[PDB]
């Protein structure tokens, strides 16, 4: 059983505090410890142990054992395995203490329960609203199963937008350049704040969740099962794959479902092929800053015939649909997967000659060097998951840790350079593509055959996982609890730019305001899987 | 001494948002792209005469008095240039002092609107735009004022002729200075978004887009009017006229064809065209 | 204060008057040949903004037909309005539709912009676009397709007309059904449709049951067609388990 090193290494340095442990899997495990004894457990399994904070969200429980649940997902990466941190806030006075003055991953999580749970961290030093917009009503909790109907929308008590912005190192003197929620090429509504002096940006705040519909509740009220598949595909349009396999892989951990053999790498063919549509996207977006326009148009082309074998594998453009709880929906043929092998390597081909851009090394010495720093240093803090932790120094990567839809049987490979600036991002991405290309060279070729469909089973009520997948931004991770055969107690996804977005503030400090918009994409930002 | 003026600058106005389709659907055509059509600007500009100004309530009688002035500005520019004799159609005006300070009217004019809206856009690319024109008119004063004293006297008409009759004796003077003259029109047609141009509408707007084509016409003919003269008149006649007209037009086309080209090819150029200048300016006074 | 609300507090869509929508349709011919379009992205979802960002790519132009995209509302003819209405996105979308010179067309783009969507019964959602401003063209789609969005902007400038219309109630509601594929008893038919969809698809697997059924005519005979014909190792698969199911019955 994996984690019990951990398990006795908190018990040591913690003699009575586990108050219950049990496991989901046999990699994943959850304790519960005591509520005023919480900050020191997160912050011993993170710094001590070298766990990394994934997720961290409330949970609504007062008809189960009465009390609010804050869970703080914890991935040991030092063999690896989930721990998960459990506490019982006390329901007439939910007060628990906070962890972000420890870890300064917990920022937004802990901001983020005040909203939907109405849970006060106490010691939490940014208290600003986060995912609620400006107009909501204060006591209205949405995620309280009995605050308010999915269904009731309150009067907008403003229409001026009353959020405030904080300037660490500016002044009264300092203007502002916005860079939203409404700006061409940004595509995706997000507001941003430069406090420059001249070009240079002394300070960056930004405001967020302006794409924030309210599909957590949504997805426990009038969604089932098999249907929050289609409301994981339509977050957003390019993680699509990512979100489903997240969600499905939460619920299929959450009961046994020994998934047929081929349904699983089948799944890791199809999420490796979305990070081909994804990446070779923002690559060419990073030709469309550093300069060249010639540079994009021909990484849209070499994006089509990505588009091209997710034309044929599925027969769909964006938003898909593949995945069902026992297996996955639609099933690849012979020559389907025959010819997609020729084509990865044909991508192969023009990926390199179009790779031979940065090799001109012009605008990418200049422009995409010195640019857009991410400190391993806070990038350890933060826990940053994406190509930000992999160009930072830290092999982070859920393919090779946590091997979730059969990837031990595919060529997986890490890459991580030293360099933190926007060309050491792109490199990631540059030899992701190839390592992607590799799998659907050696996958194709080798499926073991079986079923594809496992139905018929019965959903055990109050049984909960984590379900994981490597999104081509980070890892999003899926905690959901069954409620009963039909309908899902509750049902939490963090997107892969959700712990990626708290460190901008220190990228685009130092940086000039042209560039700026080069820094913002050279993590390729996600808002609607982040706003959810 | 009326007609002619007139008409130059009128036919200079109505020829304007060709060059600026030209260069577009070059741009289209550079990026493999099939493009728009060439007449495309003239249907945006009167589409936008068509649609009503709207501004900020902070914006008073500049913001949409502005682009007359612009345009206005560009035609009491186009008057002078030569485009089909050696000799400007109004000598009086055409002087190399009296043409950089109108210009320095346009950008005084610009940079007042882009400061009149409350938006930082505008304020930003009115500033950026007022640093271009400061970088640019020294330039472009060294390079007319070498060919001036390589002329003998400070007027257009005067320099146009003497480069008309290459006199092969100055002629690293007239090299180098035609560089930088070439230079300095690469900076002003050219950088060298959300744009200066975000608070405009309507008929503003296309009154900006008519002077912004002004512009553009203007300034690559008074390079290749002034120093490419060989194919105009000494005297304006009735007979030759077609010949003047042919090749003003296919030096303005292949101008923006080229500079479109080379732009798409790319503080380097901005020293080189101040390095030629003093190159000009050093080789007359070493020889 | 920007847009129009009930006794309660709750956002309804603005009403432009109409000296300022007599015009449309003057307007409408006037930007047929240069149509001047502002996207305006909502709550949803990057599907309907890439998309719509692909307009003007190498597979699919825009300004060959005079569509540009212009970076701000006051160079805006057509207002594009593209996810559902959040409650943190309805006030910056009504200033991009004040901001805008009247008169304006306005086009509802994708599921999520005509109604909502998936989210059109949420608390942070308004639901779909008409419901803050009005809405002169509807582009449905979960995204819509490059050539749906050049049929909606050819049809709002009046270059294609309407090609759908409503559905009513009529006589041939009344008509009785039918049995389909009624040769064999139906059980079995459900159960070899159960079976090729566990196996192959939803679509997958009517397909290859359907031909099993046409083939179940001649045994030997279509037996060998599906082995044969496709030389598919998995349809071989999925024929053989498909025949078992029938077979053992
Ligand atoms: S229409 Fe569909 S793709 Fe577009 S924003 Fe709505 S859910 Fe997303
Ligand atoms: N990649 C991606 Fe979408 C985001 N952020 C997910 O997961
Ligand atoms: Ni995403």
Not at chain 1, 322 to 342: E, S, V
Not at chain 1, 506 to 530: E, F, H, K, Q, W
Not at chain 2, 91 to 116: H, N, V
Not at chain 3, 123 to 132: E, H, L, N, P, S
Request: negative net charge; charged residues 20%.
């Amino acid at each position: 059983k994996l984690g019990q090193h951990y398990l006795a290494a908190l018990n040591e340095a913690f003699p009575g505090v586990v108050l219950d442990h049990a496991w989901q899997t046999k990699d994943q495990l959850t304790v519960t410890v005591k509520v005023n004894y919480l900050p020191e457990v997160v912050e011993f399994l993170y710094y001590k142990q070298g766990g990394w904070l994934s997720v961290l969200f409330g949970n609504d429980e007062r008809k189960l054992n009465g009390h609010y649940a804050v869970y703080y997902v914890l991935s040991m990466e030092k063999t690896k395995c989930w721990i998960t941190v459990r506490v019982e806030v006390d329901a007439n006075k939910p007060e628990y203490p906070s962890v972000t003055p420890r870890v300064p991953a917990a920022v937004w999580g802990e901001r983020e329960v005040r909203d939907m749970y109405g849970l006060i961290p106490v010691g939490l030093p940014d208290e600003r609203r986060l995912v609620l917009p400006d107009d909501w009503p204060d006591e209205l909790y949405p995620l309280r199963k009995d605050s308010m109907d999915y269904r009731q929308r309150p009067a907008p008590t403003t229409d001026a937008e009353t959020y405030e912005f904080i300037n660490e190192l500016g002044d009264k003197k300092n203007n502002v350049v916005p860079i939203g929620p409404l700006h061409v090429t940004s595509d995706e509504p997000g507001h941003f704040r430069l406090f420059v002096d001249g070009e240079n940006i002394i300070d960056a705040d930004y405001r967020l969740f302006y794409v924030h519909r309210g599909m957590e509740k949504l997805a426990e009220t009038r969604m089932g099962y098999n249907e929050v598949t289609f409301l994981s595909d339509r977050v957003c349009g390019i993680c699509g794959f990512a979100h489903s396999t997240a969600y499905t892989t939460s619920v299929e951990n959450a009961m046994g479902i020994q998934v047929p053999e081929r349904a699983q790498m089948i799944r890791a063919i199809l999420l490796e092929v979305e990070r081909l549509h994804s990446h070779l996207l923002n690559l060419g977006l990073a030709c469309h800053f550093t300069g060249f326009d010639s540079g994009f148009m021909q990484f849209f082309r070499v994006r089509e015939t990505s588009m091209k074998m997710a034309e044929i594998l599925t027969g769909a453009r964006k938003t898909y649909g593949l995945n069902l709880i026992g297996g996955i929906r639609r099933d690849l043929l012979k020559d389907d997967m025959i010819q997609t092998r020729q084509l990865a390597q044909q991508m192969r081909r023009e990926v390199q000659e179009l790779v031979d851009v940065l090799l001109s090394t012009p605008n990418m010495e200049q422009r995409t060097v010195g640019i857009g720093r991410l400190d391993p240093e806070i990038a350890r803090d933060f826990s940053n998951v994406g190509p930000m932790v992999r160009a930072s120094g830290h092999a982070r990567d859920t393919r090779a840790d946590h091997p979730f839809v059969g990837y031990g049987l595919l060529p997986m490979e890490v890459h991580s350079e030293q360099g933190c600036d926007v060309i050491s991002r792109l490199k990631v991405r540059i030899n992701e593509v190839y390592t992607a290309l590799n799998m659907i060279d050696y996958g194709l070729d080798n499926l073991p055959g079986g079923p594809l469909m496992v139905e018929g089973f019965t959903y055990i009520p109050h049984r909960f996982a984590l379900g994981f997948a490597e999104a081509p931004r980070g890892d999003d991770i899926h905690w959901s609890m069954t409620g009963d055969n039909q309908k899902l107690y509750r049902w939490r996804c963090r997107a892969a730019t959700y712990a990626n977005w708290p460190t901008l503030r220190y990228m685009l400090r130092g940086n000039t305001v042209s560039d700026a918009p080069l820094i913002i994409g050279s993590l390729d930002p996600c808002y609607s899987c982040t706003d959810r | 001494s009326v007609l002619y003026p007139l008409i130059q600058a009128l036919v200079l106005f109505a020829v304007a948002p060709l060059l600026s389709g030209i260069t577009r659907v070059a741009r289209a055509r550079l990026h493999n792209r099939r493009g728009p059509g060439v007449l495309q600007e003239y249907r945006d500009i009167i589409k936008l005469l068509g649609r009503q100004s709207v501004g900020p309530d902070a914006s008073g009688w500049v913001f949409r008095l502005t682009p007359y002035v612009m345009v206005g500005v560009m035609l009491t520019i186009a008057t002078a240039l030569p485009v089909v004799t050696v000799g400007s159609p109004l000598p009086q005006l055409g002087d190399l002092i009296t043409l950089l300070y109108l210009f320095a009217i346009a950008r005084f004019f610009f940079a007042i609107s882009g400061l009149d809206t409350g938006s930082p856009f505008t304020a930003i690319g009115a500033s950026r735009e007022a640093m271009l024109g400061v970088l640019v008119e020294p330039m472009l004063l060294l390079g007319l004022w070498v060919a001036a004293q390589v002329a003998g006297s400070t007027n257009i008409s005067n320099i146009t002729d003497t480069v008309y009759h290459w006199p092969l004796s100055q002629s690293i003077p007239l090299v180098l200075a035609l560089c930088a003259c070439a230079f300095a029109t690469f900076i002003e047609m050219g950088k060298l978004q959300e744009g200066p141009l975000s608070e405009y509408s309507g008929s503003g707007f296309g009154v900006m887009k008519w002077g912004i084509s002004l512009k553009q016409l203007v300034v690559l003919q008074m390079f290749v009017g002034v120093f490419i003269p060989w194919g105009q008149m000494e005297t304006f006649t009735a007979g030759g006229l077609l010949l003047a007209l042919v090749i003003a037009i296919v030096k303005l086309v292949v101008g923006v064809l080229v500079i479109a080209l080379f732009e798409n090819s790319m503080p380097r150029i901005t020293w080189a065209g101040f390095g030629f200048a003093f190159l000009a300016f050093v080789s007359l006074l070493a020889a | 204060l920007l847009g129009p609300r009930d006794a309660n507090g709750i956002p309804v869509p603005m009403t432009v008057d109409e000296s300022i929508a007599s015009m449309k349709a003057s307007l409408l011919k006037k930007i047929k040949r240069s149509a001047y379009v502002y996207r305006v992205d909502c709550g949803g979802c990057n599907g309907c903004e890439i998309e719509i960002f692909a307009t003007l790519s190498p597979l699919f132009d825009a300004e060959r037909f005079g569509i540009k995209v212009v970076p701000s509302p006051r160079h805006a003819d057509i207002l594009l309005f593209t996810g559902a209405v959040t409650r943190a996105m309805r006030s910056p979308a009504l200033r991009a539709w004040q901001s805008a010179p009247d008169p304006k067309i306005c086009i509802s783009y994708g599921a999520c912009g005509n109604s909502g969507g998936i989210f059109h019964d949420l608390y942070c959602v308004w639901g779909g676009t008409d419901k803050i401003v009005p809405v002169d063209v509807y582009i449905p789609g979960c995204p819509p397709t490059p050539a749906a969005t050049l049929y909606g902007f050819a049809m709002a400038l009046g270059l294609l007309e309407q090609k759908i219309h409503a559905r009513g109630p009529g006589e041939l509601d009344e008509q009785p059904a039918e049995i389909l594929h009624g040769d064999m008893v139906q059980p079995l038919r459900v159960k070899v449709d159960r079976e090729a969809r566990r196996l192959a698809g939803y679509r997958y697997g009517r397909q290859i049951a359907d031909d099993y059924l046409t083939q179940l005519g001649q045994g030997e005979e279509q037996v060998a067609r599906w082995l044969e014909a496709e030389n598919d190792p998995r349809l071989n698969e999925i024929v053989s388990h498909l025949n078992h199911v029938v077979e053992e019955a």
